[PDB]
Design a protein around this ligand. Structure first.
Ligand SMILES: CCCCCCCCCCCCCCCCCC(=O)OC[C@H](COP(=O)([O-])OCC(O)COP(=O)([O-])OC[C@@H](COC(=O)CCCCCCCCCCCCCCCCC)OC(=O)CCCCCCCCCCCCCCCCC)OC(=O)CCCCCCCCCCCCCCCCC
Ligand SMILES: COC1=C(OC)C(=O)C(C/C=C(/C)CC/C=C(/C)CC/C=C(\C)CC/C=C(\C)CC/C=C(/C)CC/C=C(\C)CC/C=C(/C)CC/C=C(\C)CC/C=C(\C)CCC=C(C)C)=C(C)C1=O
Ligand SMILES: CCCCCCCCCCCCCCCCCC(=O)OC[C@H](COP(=O)([O-])OCC[N+](C)(C)C)OC(=O)CCCCCCCCCCCCCCCCC
Ligand SMILES: CCCCCCCCCCCCCCCCCC(=O)OC[C@H](COP(=O)([O-])OCC[N+](C)(C)C)OC(=O)CCCCCCCCCCCCCCCCC
Ligand code: SF4
Lengths: 99, 115, 96, 59, 83, 70, 318, 175, 155, 97, 284, 98
């Protein structure tokens, strides 16, 4: 905040929602509670400048958890491979993938 | 699956109804038959000129009213909380405020028609 | 009359939920095996897919962290029958 | 209302002039004076209470 | 006193609707506090389990929590069964 | 004689009766005699899939009792 | 067979909508020292079919000044909503069981006004615009409480699912617990359908026919079903909402017979009210509701939220 | 096919979004918005946000309803516009429908894309997660927390509507 | 034979029309008030299938009942032109059958037919609420006896 | 027992009109199933019924002939098929058939 | 360019008023067929109403010039076609006055008697169609069955339902048929049990009250100056009635009350007409 | 990023193009003003359902409640644009050019 009163008078107005790893109704965890738990206690009171370099290899692991960016890239590459030999007809899926 | 199947079936049946309605009955159009109806005589000529209705003020307030009916809709699930003391206070706030907004809307003319 | 009946319905809901939680450990005990089995079949088959690839290490964790994550459903039902994935994702949401 | 006739007779077997005071004739002239600020639905109501039939007014 | 009672009577005559709304609306705010079941209502909501009562590891010195979901020790809700 | 009103609502009474009759019987017929399952929550939907998988015939409304297990 | 169910929920309703017209003519007539239609077949039972063929073979008038595309969408939009808003109704077992049934009830009920809206605009006339805008004025006052009464009554049901309404009403009728709300809901359901004291939008004596002035043959015939299928469905909504009958788990016949009879009794009262009272004025209608109805809704909704907590009688969510 | 049904529902959201953003006659734009709003309900309904879909549906019908009343009240012309009549809106119309056509083709054809962000077209079904909700709906239970966790949000929101009626009367007072 | 199916479809169409014709709300003078008595519970026109719908866009038979004058004759023909097809006009009462009492005046058109193609003529001054009750039913017989498709199948 | 009285009264209606076939004829063609007394039958075949205990106006009525002067007068009938001599009695112009 | 107004108020724009012009007729069901009301209204409230009449101008007063006095009688019969006997009563009295001839005592009594059931007819028409135009259709039909009965008395004495042409100068055409008066007594017994039935339907109904109370209110002097008569005077408080002030025929020898209103609005006249019903029953 | 997030984001893009690129109707502009709320509402609802952000599930309606407030006061600006200028087209309001 610019003029921090939430800390001063000691009453929470918006901190409860600011993150997805905070306490949720009936303990419904977020999708990436494990990552946001680790990321938050990684760069806490260490410094915003002293955060983007050291709490990095843990941060993108979280940013991947939200968006599955390179994970979906993996599926696209695999599915792209399927199209390029199924038409060529070298391989057939095992019955596990049919029934 | 079922929901859009139900939706598709209904629009289809309606389309056929208007289709046989608008095609079958052996039309005969002669211009004055298609002329606008004006209670027996000719129209003065407009019907797209701005029809200045007098409930404009009550119109927008209805929009504000609906914006807060959406707010007070989660009450059936809100009652199943562990903090009814807080939930009851905040719930009664909305209705008190909604009445208060109407009360100002009422007392300072407002609801009354414009003449 | 409503106030008595509603409390009775509450009594049933705990009774309903108690049967749910008692049965829950078995349901969790089945789910992990199915997802592990599903992940395996994709990865065992992934060796055949990624044999002729110039550079694709089989079974690489997309995340740097070695802790297991909740597996992403997209790769769970990735190459399964198109009907199966369709029911898997939009099943409940379409069920009626 | 006060239906009245003004009969002028020349003395022959037929009338010479017959003016017909229609109670609705004077009434209907007052439609504008009544319906001042009232809405159209009121005008429908004002017509009904006036009890006008147009045979008498159009003569 | 007389003015206040007359104003109520003048209201009740001129308008019966808002006074009825104001009255029953006014009550809806007050008796929730005076009700002796409101503390029971939160207990009922707390009793209903939506998530699993996840077990916890034993290390001794824990008499309160039971070792079996039939043992006498633990939170019991026979109050709600009769209620 | 007000009886003549009744024939009008009489066929109407049957007319509204058909839908509720149809849905109940169609649900009873398709879902193996048993009343159609309700899935208002993921737990019910998760439960329904388990029944379908263990049914073998890929049909939720095929319940196998203790004779299935040993 | 789900498709067979869909027609079994559409065609039987459609004949029910058809015979409401004959029933209303006879009910209105017999409340008038008249006899009602009794020559078209026996007891006038063939009258709806007689009007059915005439309208669909009637010359469907296309007005030149009308915008044609919007002209045809309105009858389609009116009828399509009327049928599809029957599908979540819990006739013993609802055809479409959804956790948010009443919200879907309001959504297409709110979507319904765009029929009279677009048709009123597309007709391109004075009486067309007068009817359409007073239709706004009639319906603008209308959703604000319709949601509140729905919220207040359902707040002790447990959720927005229509199926669980029967479980709540298993012991006593909902009207015993919220009769002040039921009268107010009933007036609004009498009002949302533009019926009896609130029929300004049509206004035969004052708007000739309102929005329906330039609507003939099937385009008219479609407008009649949307109005009348909404009458039956709204009364059926009220019947489940307030007079939920007993439901045997093994014989859905019992609920179906009881539920249908409740809808018939309520729909007759719609004709009962239609015969008796005069017609309001659209300013008084708005003044009646936002000056007298709406204030009572807020306090009554205030009462119906405080009541479950104070009595420890909150309903189960699941 | 219904497998990319969300791909479809997303599109007609924007064709309707384009149609009314081409600035046709005000009520015609009202139709152009509601079709997008109606299909827009479908996309979020597909993802699980049943309550969110119904509320964006419900109040925007109410929102668009009051818009129509004002359009014909003091915002309509004696010669109304159509999407075809005026060439300016016609040019705006045709530009919108080829803008999506050329792009969704490009996104679907390459499935990698670069514009603004990187997009794997693949399938929106993919990112759904293997999760169980138990006997409670997250989309509805989280909103129910507004009255137990968001007291500040309730106060600020509720207050704002109150001036919302104040301003709606303050500026309309007409001296 | 195609004649049989044409005749069967012939009977189906007209029976719908003759049992559902809607007289407009078009009253003029003395001849209109007693026509209300036809709609009154005594004779109950509605029992015979008719309904008194306004809005000539949704009406079949036009009950020209009363003195047809000069100042309104444009209004009537505009109204008649607005009525969809089929449309019938029953000239009701002696005033609309040629001028009635005021046949020789200066602002009355002598006969409703000079403006509109006038169907079956019911006389009376006024015709009794029953006298044209037959007039309406006699038109129902005229609707019964039409050929339409029979001509079309033989055109 | 008034319920079963009106029930059996309706049963005497169906039996009175020559059985079920006659009942269906008068219902489909005459639109009314009340029985009366044959006060006379004209040369053209129109039966004349009459019932003093009746609301004034329904106390006298005619069942029209099935044949009159060649034209088929099954379901299509009119009011002019009343011969004059019976027109007086039918229209309450006299109480003498 | 131009500097902004130094008081910071721009010159008021020229009027852009676009009030609707609507012709309520001559086909509207409430227009009663021949009423061409061109009214200037903004939105849904009227500002000025120009009542174009003439859609029913039969040259009655012109044609009477060419007919003998006896032949001119049916003109008045057709004039106000809901108060037939009262219409001929006006014309007959004028001709008798000019002829200096009085009708026989029996004639004057049935002229008053039939002139009063004529008041029953018109007031039935006025109140019922009022409710019909307002939107209450049911009260329309219930009386119209009863006023159908009164048309029977019309025809039993004259020959035609509406246009009796019965009240002639010098007395009525011919005596009443035997048993006519008894039939009058039977109906008059039943009628008061229906007039209150109408009052039960509307008089205390809140919807009818709001649609009719304090609406279309006309004061005393303006109503008197406007040439008003009948209910327009008695409704606003002016205690005037020709049957009492200047009694024609034998109206003096009949006791009756004249209902006078106080508010003068639409509602007060509705009671004035309904009360005129019952007062007419005393005259009968 | 999937195509659903894509096509929604692109939707707000031409909503801007509709918004600021103007025309001869202020109503149609404010139509696009509440229109671009659709994209942001639908966009926002997609993430927090996807991320199982239970708390942030109230942020859409809170966003959407404030949404029509702009429209609410926007319509009231229109009416006295009409009250004083009769019409709505955005060229007659230029007296403040000076
Ligand atoms: C958003 C999409 C808008 C698409 C569009 O152009 O709509 C025009 C459409 C027609 O405008 P109109 O005011 O009826 O004028 C039609 C004629 O110009 C004037 O009337 P008309 O009788 O001349 O109409 C016939 C005319 C125009 O065609 C039509 O009217 C047929 C229906 C519209 C077809 C496009 O036919 C042709 O020009 C030849 C067609 C081959 O205007 C709309 O507002 C309809 C939008 C529908 C959107 C989808 C709703 C679901
Ligand atoms: C000025 O002058 C005047 C007159 O005189 C000239 C008069 O006399 C009178 C007196 C007459 C009166 C009757 C008094 C009332 C009249 C007025 C004008 C006063 C004003 C009226 C009102 C305020 C009330 C108006 C009420 C109305 C119109 C009633 C409406 C309701 C009804 C039930 C009646 C109409 C019913 C209809 C049309 C029948 C049903 C409709 C259909 C379309 C038929 C069914 C069709 C289908 C099912 C579709 C086909 C599908 C099928 C068959 C399904 C299978 C096939 C598939 C493919 C699916 C007055 C007042 C007057 O002022
Ligand atoms: C559901 C309804 C099912 C039955 C529908 C039957 C068809 C009715 C169509 C309307 C009347 C026209 C018709 O029957 O044939 C058209 C035919 C078309 O050919 P036509 O030449 O007879 O048309 C009438 C004459 N002109 C062309 C001059 C207008 O018309 C008639 O039959 C009317 C005579
Ligand atoms: C889209 C297309 C859909 C097509 C659906 C198929 C059916 C459509 C038409 C249905 C009616 C066909 C008409 C033939 C029967 C008819 O009306 O006859 C009248 C005609 C009437 O002839 P009329 O016209 O002379 O009668 C009036 C004149 N008076 C009163 C003097 C008699 O009678 C007969 O032919 C005998 C019919 C008796 C039985 C009629 C049906 C009774 C049972 C009804 C049950 C409920 C049904 C719902
Ligand atoms: S025909 Fe006779 S009753 Fe009919 S309007 Fe003319 S004068 Fe009057």
């Amino acid at each position: 905040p610019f003029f921090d009163v939430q800390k001063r008078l000691g009453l929470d107005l918006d901190r409860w929602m600011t993150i997805q790893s905070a306490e949720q109704p009936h303990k419904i965890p977020g999708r990436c509670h494990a990552f946001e738990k680790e990321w938050i206690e990684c760069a806490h009171g260490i410094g915003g400048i002293r955060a983007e370099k050291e709490c990095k290899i843990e941060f993108d692991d979280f940013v991947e958890c939200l968006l599955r960016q390179k994970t979906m890239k993996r599926l696209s590459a695999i599915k792209r491979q399927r199209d390029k030999l199924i038409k060529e007809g070298k391989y057939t899926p095992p019955p596990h993938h049919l029934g | 699956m079922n929901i859009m199947l139900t939706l598709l079936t209904n629009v289809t049946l309606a389309s056929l109804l208007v289709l046989i309605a608008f095609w079958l009955p052996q039309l005969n159009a002669y211009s004055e038959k298609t002329s606008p109806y004006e209670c027996g005589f000719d129209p003065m000529g407009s019907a797209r000129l701005p029809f200045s209705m007098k409930f404009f003020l009550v119109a927008i307030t209805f929009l504000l009213f609906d914006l807060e009916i959406a707010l007070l809709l989660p009450l059936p699930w809100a009652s199943q909380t562990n903090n009814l003391k807080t939930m009851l206070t905040m719930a009664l706030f909305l209705l008190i405020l909604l009445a208060a907004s109407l009360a100002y809307e009422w007392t300072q003319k407002g609801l009354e028609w414009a003449e | 009359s409503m106030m008595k009946w509603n409390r009775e319905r509450r009594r049933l809901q705990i009774e309903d939920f108690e049967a749910r939680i008692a049965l829950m450990p078995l349901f969790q005990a089945e789910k992990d095996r199915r997802v592990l089995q599903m992940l395996r079949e994709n990865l065992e088959e992934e060796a055949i897919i990624m044999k002729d690839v110039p550079d694709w290490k089989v079974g690489e964790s997309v995340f740097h962290t070695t802790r297991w994550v909740t597996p992403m459903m997209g790769e769970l039902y990735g190459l399964r029958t198109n009907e199966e994935i369709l029911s898997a994702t939009y099943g409940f949401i379409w069920y009626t | 209302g006060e239906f009245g006739v003004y009969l002028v007779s020349d003395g022959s077997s037929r009338p010479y002039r017959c003016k017909i005071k229609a109670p609705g004739f004077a009434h209907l002239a007052g439609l504008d004076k009544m319906s001042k600020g009232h809405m159209l639905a009121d005008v429908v109501a004002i017509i009904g209470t006036q009890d006008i039939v147009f045979g008498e007014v159009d003569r | 006193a007389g003015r206040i009672a007359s104003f109520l009577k003048n209201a009740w005559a001129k308008e019966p609707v808002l006074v009825a709304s104001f009255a029953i609306g006014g009550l809806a705010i007050i008796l929730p506090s005076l009700s002796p079941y409101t503390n029971y209502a939160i207990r009922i909501n707390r009793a209903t389990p939506y998530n699993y009562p996840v077990p916890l590891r034993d290390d001794g010195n824990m008499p309160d929590v039971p070792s079996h979901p039939q043992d006498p020790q633990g939170p019991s809700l026979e109050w709600l069964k009769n209620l | 004689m007000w009886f003549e009103i009744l024939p009008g609502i009489a066929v109407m009474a049957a007319c509204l009766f058909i839908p509720g009759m149809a849905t109940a019987h169609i649900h009873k017929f398709t879902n193996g005699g048993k009343e159609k399952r309700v899935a208002h929550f993921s737990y019910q939907w998760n439960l329904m899939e388990r029944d379908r998988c263990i049914s073998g015939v890929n049909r939720y409304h095929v319940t196998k009792g203790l004779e299935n297990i040993d | 067979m789900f498709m067979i169910n869909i027609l079994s929920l559409i065609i039987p309703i459609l004949l029910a909508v058809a015979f409401l017209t004959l029933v209303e003519r006879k009910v209105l007539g017999y409340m008038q020292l008249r006899k009602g239609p009794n020559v078209v077949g026996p007891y006038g039972l063939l009258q709806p079919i007689a009007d059915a063929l005439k309208l669909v073979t009637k010359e469907p008038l296309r007005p030149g000044t009308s915008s044609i595309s919007m002209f045809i969408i309105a009858p389609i939009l009116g009828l399509s909503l009327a049928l599809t808003m029957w599908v979540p109704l819990p006739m013993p077992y609802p055809l479409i069981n959804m956790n948010l049934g009443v919200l879907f009830m309001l959504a297409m009920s709110s979507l319904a006004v765009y029929s009279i809206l677009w048709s009123g605009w597309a007709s391109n006339s004075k009486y067309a615009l007068i009817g359409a805008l007073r239709a706004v004025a009639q319906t603008i006052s209308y959703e604000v409480t319709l949601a509140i009464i729905l919220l207040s009554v359902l707040l002790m049901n447990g959720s927005y699912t229509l199926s669980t309404l029967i479980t709540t009403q298993e012991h006593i009728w909902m009207i015993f617990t919220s009769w002040p709300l039921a009268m107010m809901w009933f007036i609004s359901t009498l009002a949302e359908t533009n019926r009896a004291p609130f029929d300004l939008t049509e206004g035969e004596s004052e708007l000739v026919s309102g929005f329906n002035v330039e609507y003939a043959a099937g385009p008219f015939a479609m407008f009649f079903m949307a109005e009348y299928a909404n009458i039956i469905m709204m009364n059926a909504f009220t019947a489940i909402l307030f007079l939920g009958a007993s439901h045997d788990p093994h014989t859905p016949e019992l609920y179906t017979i009881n539920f249908v009879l409740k809808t018939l009794a309520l729909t007759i009262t719609f004709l009962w009210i239609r015969a008796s009272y005069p017609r309001f004025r659209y300013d008084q209608l708005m003044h009646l509701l936002w000056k007298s109805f709406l204030p009572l809704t807020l306090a009554l909704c205030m009462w119906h939220i405080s009541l479950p907590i104070m009595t420890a009688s909150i309903p189960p969510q699941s | 096919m219904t497998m990319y049904i969300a791909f479809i529902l997303s599109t007609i959201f924007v064709i309707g979004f384009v149609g009314f953003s081409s600035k046709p006659s005000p009520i015609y734009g009202g139709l152009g918005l509601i079709v997008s709003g109606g299909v827009g309900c479908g996309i979020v309904l597909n993802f699980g946000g049943s309550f969110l879909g119904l509320m964006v549906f419900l109040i925007y019908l109410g929102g668009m309803l009051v818009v129509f009343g004002y359009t014909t009240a003091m915002a309509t012309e004696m010669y109304p516009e159509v999407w075809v009549s005026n060439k300016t809106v016609f040019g705006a119309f045709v530009s919108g429908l080829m803008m999506e056509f050329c792009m969704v083709y490009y996104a679907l054809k390459e499935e990698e894309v670069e514009i603004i962000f990187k997009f794997n077209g693949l399938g929106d079904w993919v990112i759904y997660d293997t999760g169980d909700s138990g006997f409670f709906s997250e989309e509805a239970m989280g909103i129910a927390a507004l009255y137990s966790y968001g007291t500040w949000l309730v106060i600020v929101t509720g207050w704002s509507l109150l001036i919302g009626v104040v301003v709606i009367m303050e500026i309309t007072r007409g001296n | 034979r195609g004649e049989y199916v044409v005749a069967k479809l012939d009977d189906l169409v007209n029976w719908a029309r003759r049992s559902s014709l809607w007289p407009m709300t078009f009253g003029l003078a003395c001849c209109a008030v007693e026509m209300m008595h036809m709609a009154a519970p005594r004779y109950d026109m509605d029992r015979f299938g008719v309904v008194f719908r306004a809005s000539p866009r949704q009406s079949d038979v036009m009950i020209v009942a009363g003195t047809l004058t000069n100042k309104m004759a444009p209004a009537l023909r505009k109204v008649y032109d607005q009525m969809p097809e089929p449309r019938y006009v029953v000239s009701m009462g002696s005033c609309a059958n040629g001028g009635g009492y005021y046949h020789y005046s200066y602002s009355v058109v002598r006969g409703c037919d000079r403006i509109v193609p006038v169907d079956i003529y019911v006389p009376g001054c006024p015709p009794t609420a029953e006298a044209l009750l037959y007039g309406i039913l006699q038109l129902q017989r005229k609707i019964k006896r039409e050929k339409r498709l029979r001509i079309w199948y033989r055109r | 027992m008034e319920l079963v009285q009106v029930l059996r009264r309706g049963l005497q209606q169906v039996s009175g009109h020559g059985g079920l076939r006659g009942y269906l004829r008068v219902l489909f063609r005459a639109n009314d199933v009340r029985v009366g007394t044959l006060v006379g039958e004209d040369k053209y075949g129109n039966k004349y019924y009459e019932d003093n205990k009746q609301f004034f106006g329904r106390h006298r009525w005619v069942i029209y002939t099935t044949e009159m002067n060649g034209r088929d007068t099954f379901w299509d009938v009119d009011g002019s098929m009343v011969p004059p001599e019976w027109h007086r009695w039918l229209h309450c112009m006299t109480d003498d058939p | 360019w131009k500097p902004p107004p130094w008081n910071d108020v721009d010159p008021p724009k020229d009027t852009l008023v676009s009030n609707l012009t609507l012709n309520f007729g001559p086909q509207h069901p409430a227009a009663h067929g021949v009423l061409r009301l061109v009214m200037e209204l903004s939105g849904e409230m009227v500002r000025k109403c120009d009542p174009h009449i003439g859609l029913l101008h039969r040259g009655t007063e012109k044609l009477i010039e060419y007919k003998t006095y006896l032949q001119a009688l049916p003109y008045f019969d057709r004039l106000d076609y809901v108060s037939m006997m009262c219409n001929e009563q006006a014309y007959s009295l004028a001709v008798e006055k000019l002829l200096n001839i009085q009708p026989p005592p029996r004639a004057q009594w049935i002229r008053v008697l039939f002139g009063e059931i004529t008041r029953l007819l018109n007031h039935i028409m006025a109140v019922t169609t009022h409710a019909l135009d307002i939107g209450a259709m049911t009260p329309f039909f219930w009386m119209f069955e009863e006023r159908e009965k009164m048309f029977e008395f019309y025809e039993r004495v004259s020959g035609a339902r509406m246009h009796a042409a019965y009240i002639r100068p010098g007395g009525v055409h011919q005596d009443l048929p035997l048993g006519l008066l008894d039939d009058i007594y039977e109906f008059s017994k039943n009628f008061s049990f229906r007039i209150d039935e109408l009052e039960e339907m509307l008089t205390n109904n809140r919807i009818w009250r709001n649609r009719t109370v304090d609406i279309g209110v006309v004061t005393a002097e303006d109503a008197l100056n406007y040439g008003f008569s009948g209910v327009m005077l008695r409704g606003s408080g002016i205690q005037w009635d020709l049957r009492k002030t200047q009694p024609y025929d034998v109206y003096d020898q009949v006791e009756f009350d004249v209902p006078i209103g106080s508010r003068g609005d639409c509602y007060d006249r509705y009671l004035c007409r309904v009360e005129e019903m019952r007062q007419s029953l005393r005259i009968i | 990023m999937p195509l659903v997030y894509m096509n929604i984001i692109m939707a707000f893009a031409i909503a801007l193009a509709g918004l600021l690129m103007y025309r001869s109707h202020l109503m149609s502009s404010l139509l696009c003003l509440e229109g671009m709320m659709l994209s942001l509402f639908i966009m926002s609802t997609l993430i927090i359902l996807n991320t199982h952000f239970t708390l942030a599930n109230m942020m859409p309606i809170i966003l959407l409640v404030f949404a029509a407030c702009e429209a609410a006061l926007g319509l009231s600006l229109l009416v006295m644009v009409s009250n004083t200028y009769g019409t709505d087209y955005v060229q007659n309001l230029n007296l403040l050019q000076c």
